[PDB]
Write a protein that binds this ligand. Structure first.
Ligand SMILES: Nc1ccn([C@H]2CC[C@@H](COP(=O)(O)OP(=O)(O)OP(=O)(O)O)O2)c(=O)n1
Ligand SMILES: [Cl-]
Ligand SMILES: [Cl-]
Ligand SMILES: [Mg+2]
Ligand SMILES: [Mg+2]
Ligand SMILES: [Mg+2]
Length: 538
DNA sequence: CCACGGCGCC
RNA sequence: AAAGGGCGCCGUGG
């Protein structure tokens, strides 16, 4: 069953890393399988040079390690991508092997054999699924090479700035904690919401605003505290303490340790088979949880900087999910908002707060956004009434008035649920599927939860599909200009270009992103250039 | 790791 | 008056 290295062209690779992060790992073993015959590499790094592509489970990760080693080894077929298209609950090689056959072990030869076996199995299961195969060939497979480039290229950090920030934030946390304990009259677990609830609402007697979801306790969530800002001096201190503590522990302190000593850069890991709707995920750091608006969240982006002689170019799709909803629903009022170049959240804020659009400040706009997303995407009158501190019947009436402004959105939700009940799944514009078997559940809460998943997925997943396709379309032209693609998070992409090319790069990227796919509304992209991510994000 | 819950980012 | 989606974190249980 064994055979000498090197393998024939087209064989499936298997590999074992010393740790899960390819930029940080040694390649313990490398092997390839073809016709069930397995070829094991005598010297893994040397053997990488024999391969023309990385074809097999986790191909992107081997490509990342190859790039570190100065080798252009593009990722090719990967059964993980096939499995994820078949059903996005398929997210790990372990889970995929368990579901479809075989076993994910710690031996390279066995992994190579499994890759071959899973490719055949899953490819067969996809026969005739032309829309999923289009996603595979035109989005997922080429995107894997883009993600390999992003992860291996990494991004420069201003480590001196982070070190200073850590000292400054620690000092401020200490001051805040001390002042909180003084205002409270005693020390307590400032990280315990149960203890906070007691201090705020029993001991200091502040009025409670909201109830927690499941247990109906007095909520201490940020929105409640924000509304109690002027009720007691302790409140603003708690809010600040919570945020500083969180960002220090998750970003400010860990980031400098993630700088790779060989590259001098941070190598964020991107995963394209991780979420239920098709959104990309990042880890080490998870970029998702860096706040956009707060001073410290902004200071964190200031720590992400361009290489000397380069600039960062940051591009953000403006309200892409709402534009997708306009497209999918065909709602005329929604389409009109974007055709007329208006801001959805400002327009609706003006409507719901009864003030002119110019009077909609960022605080009001933030409040409106939270209401819009909650209402559009399925919040009940009960929850809305509690959070808005209004009677139930008033919240129920607001919801009806809201959808009366966008009548075809409701029609779209209903049609989507009707077809989903029939088919057992829902789909994005490009045909990415999420299975929703609980649409036929008899238990009311179980069925209704399935419905909310079902009509949310086509919007979020289509937005994600669009970003991924834009990345695929942009990448080769970027490389032609000597530029790099570094980060993707939220609705944003961050590139790095030589200073002399940055303006041309910004123009090209905006164009490619705005024209990625024709919709019933235009796509808008905001673009900025700077030596750091914050300066570029403006 | 799994469950539960509140809370936090988009 | 059963609780928007996605992704996380922590706490509590094991
Ligand atoms: N509470 C929230 C917040 C966000 N989102 C989803 C919907 C839009 C997407 C991106 O968030 P934002 O960029 O903040 O929203 P936006 O519509 O693009 O508004 P803005 O112009 O302020 O960015 O995340 C959501 O479902 N629920
Ligand atoms: Cl650098
Ligand atoms: Cl379901
Ligand atoms: Mg936005
Ligand atoms: Mg949970
Ligand atoms: Mg938040």
């Amino acid at each position: 069953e064994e055979a000498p290295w090197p393998p024939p062209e087209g064989a499936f690779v298997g590999f074992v890393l010393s740790r899960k992060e390819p930029m940080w790992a040694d390649l313990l073993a490398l092997a390839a399988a073809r016709g069930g015959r397995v070829h094991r590499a005598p010297e893994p790094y040397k053997a990488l040079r024999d391969l023309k592509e990385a074809r097999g489970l986790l191909a992107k990760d081997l490509s990342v390690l190859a790039l570190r080693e100065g080798l252009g080894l593009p990722p090719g077929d990967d059964p993980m991508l096939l499995a994820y298209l078949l059903d996005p609950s398929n997210t790990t090689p372990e889970g995929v092997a368990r579901r479809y056959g075989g076993e994910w072990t710690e031996e390279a030869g066995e992994r190579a054999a499994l890759s071959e076996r899973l490719f055949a199995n899953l490819w067969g299961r996809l026969e005739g699924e032309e829309r999923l195969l289009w996603l595979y060939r035109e989005v997922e497979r080429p995107l894997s090479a883009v993600l390999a480039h992003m992860e291996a290229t990494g991004v420069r950090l201003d480590v001196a700035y982070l070190r200073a920030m850590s000292l400054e934030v620690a000092e401020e946390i200490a001051r805040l904690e001390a002042e909180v304990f003084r205002l409270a009259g005693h020390p307590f677990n400032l990280n315990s919401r149960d203890q906070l609830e007691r201090v705020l609402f029993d001991e200091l007697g502040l009025p409670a605003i909201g109830k927690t979801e499941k247990t109906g306790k007095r909520s201490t969530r940020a929105a409640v505290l924000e509304a109690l800002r002027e009720a007691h001096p302790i409140v603003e201190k708690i809010l600040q303490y919570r945020e500083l503590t969180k960002l220090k522990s998750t970003y400010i302190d860990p980031l400098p340790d993630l700088i790779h000593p060989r590259t001098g850069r941070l190598h964020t890991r991107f995963n394209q088979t991780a979420t239920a709707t098709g959104r990309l995920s990042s880890s080490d750091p998870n970029l998702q949880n860096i706040p956009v608006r707060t001073p410290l969240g902004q200071r964190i982006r200031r720590a992400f900087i361009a290489e000397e002689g380069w600039l960062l170019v940051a591009l953000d799709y403006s309200q892409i999910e709402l534009r997708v909803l306009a497209h999918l629903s065909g709602d005329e009022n929604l389409i009109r908002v974007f055709q007329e170049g208006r801001d959805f959240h400002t327009e609706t804020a003006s409507w719901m707060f009864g003030v002119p659009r110019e009077a909609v400040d960022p605080l009001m706009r933030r409040a409106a956004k939270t209401i819009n997303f909650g209402v559009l995407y399925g919040m009940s009158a009960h929850r809305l009434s509690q959070e808005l501190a209004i009677p139930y019947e008033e919240a129920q009436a607001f919801i009806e008035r809201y959808f009366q402004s966008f009548p075809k959105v409701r029609a779209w939700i209903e049609k989507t649920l009707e077809e989903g009940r029939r088919r057992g799944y829902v789909e994005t514009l490009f045909g990415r599927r999420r299975y929703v078997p609980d649409l036929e559940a008899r238990v009311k809460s179980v069925r209704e939860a399935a419905e909310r998943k079902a009509f949310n997925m086509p919007v979020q997943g289509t937005a994600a599909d669009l970003m991924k396709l834009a990345m695929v379309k942009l990448f080769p032209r970027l490389e032609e200009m000597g530029a790099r693609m570094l980060l993707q998070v939220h609705d944003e992409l961050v590139l790095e270009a030589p200073k002399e090319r940055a303006e041309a790069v910004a123009r090209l990227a905006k164009e490619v992103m705005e024209g990625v796919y024709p919709l019933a509304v235009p796509l808008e992209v905001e673009v900025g250039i700077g030596e750091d991510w914050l300066s570029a994000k403006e």
